[PDB]
């Protein structure tokens, strides 16, 4: 994010970090067990990190849940990025701790 500001900690509770040895993409929690991201973020192995603010420091609210299924849109086009969408099914439901 260029030209932005530091979000208030945990004020974006649907924001997730996609991690495969390093942070490589963002995503959005859309139900207890499903995350929406970009098709060009496809990787064969993905750990979803929820509840993150500082992604280098363990601060107390992290949930690390590995992806059980990674489903890219079947009409995703790698040249044009048409249909740039991907779904991730978490191996376990995320704990919804925000009301």
């Amino acid at each position: 994010i260029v030209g932005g500001y530091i979000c208030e900690e945990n004020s974006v509770p649907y924001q997730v970090s996609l991690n495969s040895g390093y942070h490589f993409c963002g995503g959005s929690l859309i139900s207890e067990q499903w995350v929406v991201s970009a098709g060009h973020c496809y990787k064969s192995r993905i750990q979803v990190r929820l509840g993150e603010h500082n992604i280098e420091v363990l601060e107390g609210n992290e949930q690390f849940i590995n992806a059980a299924k990674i489903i890219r849109h079947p009409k995703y086009n790698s040249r044009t990025l048409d249909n740039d969408i991907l779904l991730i099914k978490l191996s376990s439901p995320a704990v919804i701790n925000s009301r």
Binding site: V2, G4, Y14, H23, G26, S31, K69
Partner: protein
């Protein structure tokens, strides 16, 4: 941690939206933040988006940000949210550089996939 709602209508030009991510915070070079970054940016009109990226904007894409540049998503923000009024309107997708003039961010139009998302969840 909580879920964001799927959109009930397609994006509307002018709508103030929240974009967030841990992507690069610089146009030149690289500074990857440790703390999550936020940006408030308006949806651009369909004509501004096409005029910015002639022939490259499909029905499944829309533009958010500032034609003057300066404020944009960037490398490492891909896949993250564009949210307004409690709904996920966009997914960070692509663009020409970061915060360059005449080159706003391009985002996946989530509304077009509401049925694909529900169908895929039900089948899995």
């Amino acid at each position: 941690v909580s879920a964001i709602s799927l959109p009930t209508a397609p994006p509307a030009a002018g709508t103030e939206s929240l974009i967030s991510g841990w992507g690069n915070t610089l146009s030149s070079g690289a500074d990857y933040p440790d703390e999550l970054q936020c940006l408030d940016a308006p949806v651009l009109s369909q004509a501004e988006c096409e005029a910015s990226y002639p022939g490259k904007i499909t029905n499944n894409m829309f533009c958010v940000g500032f034609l003057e540049g300066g404020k944009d998503s960037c490398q490492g923000d891909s896949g993250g949210p564009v949210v307004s009024n409690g709904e996920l309107q966009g997914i960070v997708s692509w663009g020409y550089g970061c915060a360059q003039k005449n080159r706003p961010g391009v985002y996946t139009k989530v509304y077009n996939y509401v049925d694909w998302i529900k169908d895929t969840i039900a089948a899995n």
